[PDB]
Amino acid sequence: WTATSGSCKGRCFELQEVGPPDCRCDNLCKSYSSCCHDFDELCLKTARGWECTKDRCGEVRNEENACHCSEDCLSRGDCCTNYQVVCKGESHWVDDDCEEIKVPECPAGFVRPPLIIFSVDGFRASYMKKGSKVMPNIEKLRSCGTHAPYMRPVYPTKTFPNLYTLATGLYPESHGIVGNSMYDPVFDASFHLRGREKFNHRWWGGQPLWITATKQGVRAGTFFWSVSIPHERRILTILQWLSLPDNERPSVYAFYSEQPDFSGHKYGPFGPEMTNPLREIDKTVGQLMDGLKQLRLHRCVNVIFVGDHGMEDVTCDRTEFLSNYLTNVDDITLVPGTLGRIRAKSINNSKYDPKTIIAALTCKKPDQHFKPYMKQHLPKRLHYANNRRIEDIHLLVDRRWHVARKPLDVYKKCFFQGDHGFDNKVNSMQTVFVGYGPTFKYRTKVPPFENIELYNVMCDLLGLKPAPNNGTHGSLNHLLRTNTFRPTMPDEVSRPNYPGIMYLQSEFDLGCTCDDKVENKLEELNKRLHTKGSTKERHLLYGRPAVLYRTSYDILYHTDFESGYSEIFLMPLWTSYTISKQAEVSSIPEHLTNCVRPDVRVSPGFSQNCLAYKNDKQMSYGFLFPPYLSSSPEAKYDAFLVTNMVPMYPAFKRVWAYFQRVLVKKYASERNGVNVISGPIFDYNYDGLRDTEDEIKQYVEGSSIPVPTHYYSIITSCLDFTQPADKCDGPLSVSSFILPHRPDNDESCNSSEDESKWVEELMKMHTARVRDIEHLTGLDFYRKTSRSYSEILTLKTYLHTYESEI
Ligand SMILES: *[C@@H]1O[C@H](CO)[C@@H](O[C@@H]2O[C@H](CO)[C@@H](O[C@@H]3O[C@H](CO[C@H]4O[C@H](CO)[C@@H](O)[C@H](O[C@H]5O[C@H](CO)[C@@H](O)[C@H](O)[C@@H]5O[C@H]5O[C@H](CO)[C@@H](O)[C@H](O)[C@@H]5O)[C@@H]4O)[C@@H](O)[C@H](O[C@H]4O[C@H](CO)[C@@H](O)[C@H](O)[C@@H]4O[C@H]4O[C@H](CO)[C@@H](O)[C@H](O)[C@@H]4O)[C@@H]3O)[C@H](O)[C@H]2NC(C)=O)[C@H](O)[C@H]1NC(C)=O
Ligand SMILES: Cn1c(-c2cc(OCC3CC3)c3ccccc3c2)n[nH]c1=O
Ligand SMILES: [Ca+2]
Ligand SMILES: [Cl-]
Ligand code: NA
Ligand code: NA
Ligand SMILES: [Zn+2]
């Protein structure tokens, strides 16, 4: 109950929300159906419109008016935003030349430049160029400030997950808003766009920027706006707050527009009807900037213009129906649309089986427009598994498509022409970022980056210490004139051992064989130097990775590769090697086909054994340094060491062999040499983080050889490809992947064809950031470069998307 008989007199858009049944006058009261009776009359005034006119100039103040044109309005802070233009002969902000803002130019009593976050729903990245002619205020912000060509949203590319990621710096799996619609099995409660449950605080995890600010003594304007409050009123309210006395005035503000998303759904991302919504948004921006200019705040405030996701062409006729695949369609619940999530309709159904559901949904029609996954098998770059609100079964839907349970759901619930939610690397889902103000750089373009990085920057802009989050703090330092955050590299926790020759061949009883006993002081000194690390500068270009947890491991040197060998996991944590543009591919000689050689530096007790693989009828093995790329017939023996071996399903070896035999050489040719670091990943609990030894769920039969869930590789070269990878003077270029180690290739519908028709496509889907691999391995890469650490942090967050131009 709310006894709405109290009053909003002097309380309009109050920052501190009052507790029921005391009626509310805050910018959310409408949403809670709890405003005081006089809210509309006092707080949502509209009389005379939103603009001053020549005859209103100098007028006597009339408190019924929506905004004012009287002499006292500036000090009162409630002039219409075009007041000085109409009445005092000023120019609109957009018509002024831009001038570098070297320092904040703020009124006396401002303790820090305010931050205003201007967020636009469904503002696709390509609107910046394609709509440039009709958005002159936004074009000025973009060209005069700091801008990215696009900003990557999080998956799923829906509104709530992305706005809450913006506020927290967290992946949806960690902040808990994993979709626009959710069932939480622990609460046994559902979250929906319509309705009351979404206001319960138990949905919302992490620590959003407004709480971070408050806890550290920085005042915040309210971020959420009830949909009915007109945009002009939201802007005038912000301007009024900025006119409060020093002790009451917030330092951070948010504006939110439901456009262009709302029209985008109805007309498609580029429907002709889209011009007007873009014009109207640009007009709102201009009202904000004109209003700031009137208050002498237009060179004081930092403004962020940011979208939550883009918009794609999607119509009713592009719907796949689960009823075309499943006979049991009524025993499941589908969360539908541009992604799918499936659970059992009833938990009392003992016959429900996710394995047979997956199989009935796998590669059944030739151009099937969705792909089923257990959530732990989704591309790791999506970070979309570690939450009980994410159903075990997931459908990744092709761009431009919908999935639905039955045809009746679509025609009984064509309206729409646009939608979003798809894979966050899809071009049409990309969104925008512009930063403008004294703290941002002037006329600067920065590379694309992910929205999880913004929370840290907004903290930096406000002098706040960020809560723990998924951004990499420092990786956006190149956006900023000052207030950069200067992190130190993490300290290595475990130092390596450097074992020499310590074991005789006959001490090994591993069931391994190699035809290698075929026999010189010239080249015997030479081989010992290679084993002492004489070629390590060639194969370890950026220093060895640092181990950031407590463990026991060895550095092993070789002619062609260097490795950090885990005595706990019985295999390398990492293997590093460089392949020049000139390098040659050879084959495995016949006599060495099943050769596995004991490593006399490493005890039998800390070694894998061949008998375990013989006995394990499902498990085979591969090598981290590829024998195919050995530098000489004599160096090739090193690649057959038991310490270079790793467990691989036969199905996975098809993938791995094509990457090692074909793709590495191809990249070396295209990039002028590549350095490669490859290794295993164990993430059995799908939390995105390195598993400890006791979390491993599968071993090679009869052994303590743990089976990786994934294999990574990090492929680095010179950004200036006219310099060879091993002789690079400047910035680096990287691409990486985290391939799932799976016993079949069901994921790849064309896998019965030659690897050249399907392996690269799989690899592209499982592209990764170095930083993703770091979380998954507890390693820290690029420790020894000639580059600034912030620049290296940016490199570590780079994702190679394989999408055509934006
Ligand atoms: C992205 O960035 C984020 C933020 O840094 C990273 O997420 C963190 O991961 C940490 C490491 O796993 C994790 O630390 C754990 O915290 C537990 C206490 O957590 C509570 O308090 C914090 C602080 O206020 C709060 O943030 C948490 O909020 C989570 O949970 C609530 C649900 O109530 C949600 O509303 C909220 O959205 C968030 O959920 C997410 O995280 C949880 C995990 O905490 C997931 O389960 C959810 O799915 C969702 O993803 C909590 O309110 C603490 O109990 C843990 O300690 C256990 O393990 C350590 C290991 O060192 C051990 O020392 C302890 O003994 C303890 O073990 C005992 O309990 C076990 C389980 O009950 C039991 O098995 C044992 O036998 C022991 O008895 C642990 O320290 C941290 O909470 C989250 N933080 C957030 C905000 O998510 C994330 O990793 C990053 N991602 C990547 C890829 O890098
Ligand atoms: C969705 N929605 C919101 C709205 C605005 C938000 O932030 C605005 C700015 C910080 C990015 C939000 C931030 C986080 C979570 C939900 C949000 C909802 N207000 N009105 C409305 O319909
Ligand atoms: Ca893990
Ligand atoms: Cl959803
Ligand atoms: Na086997
Ligand atoms: Na297949
Ligand atoms: Zn939408």
Ligand 1, residues at Cβ distance < 6 Å: 170-171, 173-176, 205-206, 383, 386-387, 468-470, 688-689, 775
Q: What are phi and psi of 306, to 5 degrees?
A: -145, 145
Query: Exposure string (b/e) for 38-65, b if CB count within 10 Å is 16 or more?
Result: bbeebbbbeebebbbeeebeebeeeeeb
Which of 146, 159, 212, 578 is the catalytic position? 159
Q: Which atom of ligand 2 is nearest to the CA of 308?
A: 11
CA 741 to ligand 2 centroid distance, Å: 39
Residue type, 754: D
Separation between Cα atoms, residue 179 and residue 636, nearest integer Å: 51
DSSP 3-state of 272: helix
The pair of structure tokens assigned to 204 is 């919302």
**C-alpha distances out from residue 643 to 160, 502, 516, 547, 779, Å:** 48, 15, 16, 18, 19
Identify the helix (H) or strand (E) that includes residue 460: helix 454-462
Identify the helix (H) or strand (E) that includes residue 402: strand 402-404
Q: How was this structure determined?
A: X-ray
Residue type, 189: A
The pair of structure tokens assigned to 738 is 């985290």
Length of the chain in terms of residues written = 806
> Ion ligand 4 — residues with CB under 5 Å?
179-181
By CB atoms closer than 10 A (0-12, 13-18, 19+), residue 87 is: buried
- 424 within 8 A of 155, measured Cβ to Cβ: yes
Resolution of this entry in Å? 1.9
Q: What are phi and psi of 94, to 5 degrees?
A: -60, -25
Separation between Cα atoms, residue 434 and residue 144, nearest integer Å: 10
CA 264 to ligand 7 centroid distance, Å: 8
- 133 within 8 A of 177, measured Cβ to Cβ: no
DSSP string, 319-362: EEEGGGT-S-GGGEEEE-BSEEEEEES-TT-TT--HHHHHHHTS
Ligand 2, residues at Cβ distance < 6 Å: 117, 119, 160, 163-164, 166-167, 223-225, 227, 254, 256, 258
Angle at 778 between CA 776 and CA 784, to 5 degrees: 120
Separation between Cα atoms, residue 61 and residue 48, nearest integer Å: 13
Separation between Cα atoms, residue 717 and residue 776, nearest integer Å: 23
DSSP 494: B
Residue type, 604: P
Q: Which atom of ligand 1 is nearest to the CA of 468?
A: 5
CA 363 to ligand 6 centroid distance, Å: 8
CATH level 2 (architecture), domain 505-797: 3-Layer(aba) Sandwich (3.40)
Give the helix, strand, coil percentages of the chain, each rounded to 5: 30, 20, 50
Residue 159 falls in the annotated catalytic set: yes
DSSP 3-state of 391: coil
Query: Exposure string (b/e) for 472-504, b if CB count within 10 Å is 16 or more?
Result: bbbbbbbbbbebbbeeeeeeeeeebeebeeebe
